[PDB]
Symmetry: D2
Subunit: 419 residues, 4 copies
């Protein structure tokens, strides 16, 4: 069981180059199941989830190869089932159902169980496919979908904003007969990126980025080359790294317009931020951050994927900061761990009352999820002494070589064998 | 204390002509404070709040008068205060602060206290004006704002979706120096309508209806003629009137695209719905409605202003319906009253578990707010016997002659004076 | 519409004599319906609710007259109904159902609608009576109960702690055939007081004050004399009065053991508290209070009836105080009003985040409920300037001559007419 | 990674003998640290947590051994620290802090991190010890407590009901100087059992089982023999096993008075229940259960440790059942798993809306916690087909030979080796 041994305090500063967005690469890779011709997806980060996705695609009869890019050849797809033992390691595989049924008239994915940060039901995904004409049946833990011929475009109103469901529906609609309209669609940058990828394959889509997406089905999708956009969460994570350590940092290969909420909040915390066409710089000028108030919500509001990181910022900030999480029912698992490091906070329903302290104390903590693990690692960087973050495998799911990037910023970190 | 005596059951059917939107007319009337030339706002409903708004405007030195239209002449505004005894009757008067400060460099509105359905703080309004350069201070219960010279355009990220705050900021920005960008802006139809009104006066706005509104300030705004859009909540209310009484109805002067969520939910309840360019028809074919699940959220999702009405629908529907309110913390006040009429339901935090029953029994109930009062009146229409809805004054705030429109649909309703 | 005009700031200090408990007198007065012989209830406060109760009792055919005591002669009862017009002004009228059905085999009370602080359903009351053998129906807004012969003792497990329901069931069981056991009964001091009153009339009860109350029915109850215990909420209100004004006070005719939670919290806020057999003294030594964290819950925990008052204390305390209300869904109505006076707070679900300030500014505020009104009046006493609390009629419901008592403590207060 | 392979459907019926209470054995075992003479604790279940507790005790310099009983000789404790690697596997080890500091004037336990069902802070434990005079510092992830001489008795008001904190304080107080009074103490049967155990060692305690526990310290505690009471949760689990499979069962070595709430709810579901001095029988008469409504709360109300099991009951019951969890913020982890087996439900905040179905379908599910694992195993027993419950190690933490006991009731179950 790998772990990270971090020695602090160390001011994090310097430069870092942002990798491709994990949450854009994943939906785009599954969307590739729709491509009949050759496809090359560029700037794909090297993450555990990308490996799992490739393993799943390959089992479906896809030809997959990667490096900076991931080359996909769907053409000859002969299997249409996502095994239980595979989706249990990555629920994002639910995104295979849509393309499979839309292109091959059938598909079955193991119904994902609960996740650490929430139950994360997938009802809207199913509701959407059903509205497009698919017939779904649940048996042996497998959501089995089928349709006689092509799906039919439909006017679908989402009764809850879902990034995942928007992707599933939008993807399946590209090969549908007629026009589909998604009301109250998710506006996340990844949705826009997935949309443009589909359009590159020949799909006809408009409205991506707004709460109404219109898709006009076509007979088939070809192939092509598409470069994934920068990972805004990785970017926000490193900007926070500097903000909490009094450092200064410049993120290269960034996309500023995808972080208005985060940048605004960082400025409220006292950061000196400047942006360029493809870079963001943050300088704390050696100052301790000012406590801020946050409320997660669908894009363009403050993203829930940044909440754990900002919880940390508040826990070492000047004043009382309050964070309210409205997307996932169980995303405060990092709090009890940071408290072990000396933080002071109380959880009341879905909001954490933070009472910032001068300095944290190194201690043995346990990563519970992707963003929490990154938060605990950053905590170790600025804490006084040695911190051991157990279960860092979580971090390998969404951060490409974070160990190296952090070290290059002045961190004293070492990955060490488990047990 | 006026009351409504309703005798049922009576199947509501026929036609109704929708009046101008209450929530478009209000923000537009206050926006008129920016106009230097004469203004004519058409299709303005005759509601108690419109009277109060006119009173307030006149009290600021505006020349106001009305019929179907409301004619405004704010060329010589010579007062900049919205008195307590006035805003205590209509919290929407907070919308005067923005235009006053943007055009005259000053303004003071009584800080509104709590409302029945929620505390409804106005912090985002103030936060927005402050970001535009205004200096605000609260003294003696009055929110006093000032700015030397014009306001300056700014990039403002709304850490909460607010219809009111979006209106305040967007309105004040039209006369600001530079460009303003509102991130995570409210996308309600009224916002779009208010934006187009401002544009008609000469303002430069784009993005209305999306989560990013861009305003480029100008030196001054002129005058003109603008027709308010159809009231989608009145429309939804009457469509529900038919859906719960097994009737059929056609709403004239309607705007279908503003009700996707509502129409989708009505179909789920079993309604046969047809739409035209400016009309909507619903036929229940004498059927009892099927219970539905609702989750209120910012537009284009299911509107909280229709929640009470749908609570009623579920309470007389076949099955167990669940309604989750996410906009206002206390908007279930109608529930205890309907229970007096024989309804069955339990309130768990912010959601009501409904157990539909065949029929309701007439009884004495009390209106607690605008939408609840309309719900109780509809309940009386389909309940068995005589229902008395006390304090219907609430209904006069947002429904233009609902008594007449309902009667024309077959309702047995009478307005009883003094208690 | 009476109002209170308060001039501040003024230290509140001196002495006050606590009146009889409003919430002990009420259930005991209704319990008297069980008495076949004369009954004298001593130390009954002069409150609006006591008048309404006497009005209701008299209209049931009871002979009632009062001063310090309330003399009851329920030997004859010619009416077994509590009218809408009457219960709509006091939901506590529901307590008449139990005794009426237990002694006369029948009874009906108008089903109370919603209340300001919560829906306050009365299901457990009905559930309890039904378990004792009563048959209950809801027709035309009235809950009609009946039983052929006596009620039969039963083992009732309350699946929720309810003061009201415990009183209803315990009272009705005294005339039941057999033994009744109430599991998870409310342990409030008033329950104990009501129990001892019944025992004085000849009833056989044990366990009052614990979560298991055992009642052994008897054929009939006689009469007697019983003195109501001190009102712990009035006591807590005056102790808070001193704590927030840096003053000192001694409450006479108090019962310390009924306020462990409150006294503990006041000490946490920095109060110097001393207690005697029947008195409590609190001295702030001119100190500003320290913010505290509160979580309302059934007795002996912190009482929800003290919550509004402690919200005030936190709002003028040094630090960030957090209050969580778990008894009533909407009991933060005082918050928006105090904010008008300069307080700083945010409401997140069922908890208020308070940010204490040095001084409050006088302003026009509106009482929304009993405890809130008292809170707004105390606010006016310590605020800078003139405060006008509209609708103080609310305060007359549960505070006997609060004006006089506050004045005797140094308050500058006066009641004025004119809505 | 051990798993359970279950073949269904199978009616569970017959008899089972209840083991000693896990949650009474644990606090009593730690309480033994106070004993200067050898102690024999009888009827101790063979659970993983008992092993861990013995490991910890031994590691403190205690002589421990077991079979049906666990023999303890803590006469020579020479070590006072609970290590991270140990408490991370069982947070209940926090109960070592109290006795250690009360008897040896010092003690340090690793601050437990978050748990699956909730953050489970331990603040009240620390607050209590501090009130008794201990000085508590937090360093390196270790809560370190110390006191010069003996602790002093104090009047402690628990501003929240906590089983664990009540045990910690009550245990430490036995060796304190003076009298301690715990206000708003937990009333759980285990508290009563732990109290009587301490009294057996010579401690002076009264009030256990009520809101107020009074402890009068003594110089030292001796030794003795104490038999742990029956495990009410195990009992409830098997009663539910019968109730959901139409079977009949008799639990031997049971203690009925500890399950009033559960038995009442089972009757509401339609069970025919009879009780004896030390046994409980439940017969469903082949009847499918009726949906019920539950709201967890402190004893004697419906226990949260039975919530998962009752969620299952509702999911296969006739009707819509609603369960509201008020003790732990994340105890619905079994829901998503049961949904994989065909169950239908929605989670809204802290309550689950259940829509019972005829029969469940076997599938691969994952145990997430102790009670959830038992629920998934019972689900497998009544589901159609083969169910595989992964991670059943969870079940070994609180159920002694559940495999054997279930088999003896007609279950087709088998523990297949890792993987
Ligand atoms: C793969 C991917 O796109 N993941 C990201 C994606 O995930 P997801 O698609 O599940 O989001 P959704 O918008 O659909 O869910 C939002 C809310 O909607 C509910 N929901 C979702 C679908 C549905 O059918 N029904 C439903 O009720 C959720 O249970 C939740 O309460 O959107 C989230 C919100 O912006 C990110 O927070 C997440 O990232 C994380 C946690 O990734 P993870 O899944 O890998 O763990 C992250 O990296 O931070
Ligand atoms: C005047 C008018 O336009 N009113 C409509 C308008 O009202 P409002 O501007 O207050 O909505 P907001 O979007 O700003 O509020 C939404 C949420 O944001 C909070 N909020 C709002 C402003 C702020 O500074 N801070 C803040 O925390 C609210 O307290 C709430 O929790 O938008 C609501 C949502 O779509 C309608 O539900 C409402 O209609 C009602 C209730 O009208 P009412 O105000 O007249 O009573 C209705 O007719 O149903
Ligand atoms: C008359 C009297 O004894 N009133 C006091 C009494 O009132 P009540 O009996 O209604 O309390 P309950 O214990 O029954 O209510 C507690 C919780 O239980 C719910 N509840 C109650 C009864 C029931 O059948 N079902 C049910 O679901 C409530 O709706 C609430 O969510 O107990 C409350 C809690 O300690 C006091 O807060 C209240 O006092 C106030 C507000 O008086 P009020 O009734 O006059 O307005 C107060 O003076 O502060
Ligand atoms: C070891 C043991 O006695 N465990 C049982 C024991 O556990 P615990 O001591 O933690 O209960 P508490 O009463 O103290 O906690 C109740 C509530 O109080 C909070 N709490 C607790 C202590 C504190 O200092 N502060 C605080 O805020 C909790 O975080 C929770 O929100 O009481 C619970 C309630 O009756 C059982 O539900 C639990 O059983 C479970 C989950 O066992 P577990 O601890 O092994 O996981 C079970 O079902 O077996």
């Amino acid at each position: 069981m790998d772990k990270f041994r971090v020695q602090g305090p160390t001011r994090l500063q310097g430069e870092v180059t942002i990798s491709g967005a994990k949450n854009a690469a994943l939906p785009i890779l599954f969307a590739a199941l729709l491509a009949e011709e050759p496809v090359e997806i560029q700037n794909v980060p090297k993450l555990k989830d990308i490996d799992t996705t490739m393993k799943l695609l390959t089992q479906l009869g896809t030809k997959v190869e990667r490096x900076g890019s991931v080359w996909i050849d769907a053409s000859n797809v002969n299997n249409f089932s996502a095994p239980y033992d595979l989706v249990k390691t990555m629920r994002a595989s639910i995104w295979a159902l849509g393309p499979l049924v839309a292109r091959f008239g059938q598909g079955q994915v193991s119904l994902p169980g609960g996740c650490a940060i929430g139950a994360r039901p997938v009802d809207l995904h199913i509701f959407g496919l059903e509205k497009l004409g698919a017939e779904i049946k649940l048996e042996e833990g497998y959501v089995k979908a089928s349709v006689n011929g092509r799906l039919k475009g439909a006017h679908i109103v989402m009764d809850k904003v879902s990034v995942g469901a928007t992707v599933t529906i939008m993807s399946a609609a590209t090969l549908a007969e007629g026009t589909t309209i998604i009301e109250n669609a998710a506006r996340e940058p990844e949705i826009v990126d997935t949309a443009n990828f589909l359009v590159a394959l020949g799909a006809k889509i408009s409205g991506q980025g707004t709460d109404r997406i219109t898709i006009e089905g076509v007979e088939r999708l070809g192939g092509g080359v598409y470069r994934v956009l920068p990972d805004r969460i990785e970017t926000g994570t490193f900007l926070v790294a500097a903000a909490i350590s009094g450092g200064k940092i410049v993120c290269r290969n960034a996309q500023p317009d995808t972080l208005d909420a985060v940048l605004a909040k960082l400025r409220e915390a006292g950061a000196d931020i400047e942006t360029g066409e493809d870079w963001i710089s943050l300088d704390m000028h050696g100052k301790r951050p000012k406590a801020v108030t946050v409320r997660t919500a669908p894009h363009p509001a403050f993203p829930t994927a940044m909440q754990a990181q900002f919880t940390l910022l508040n826990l070492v900030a000047e004043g009382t900061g309050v964070i309210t999480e409205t997307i996932f029912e169980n995303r405060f698992m990092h709090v009890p761990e940071l408290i072990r490091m000396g933080a002071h906070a109380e959880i009341e329903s879905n909001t954490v009352i933070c009472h910032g302290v001068e300095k944290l104390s190194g201690a043995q903590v346990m990563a519970t999820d992707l963003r929490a693990s990154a938060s605990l690692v950053l905590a170790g960087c600025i804490a006084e002494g040695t911190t051991v973050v157990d279960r860092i495998y979580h971090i390998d799911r969404g951060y490409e070589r974070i160990e190296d990037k952090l070290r290059a910023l002045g961190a004293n970190i070492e990955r060490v064998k488990g047990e």
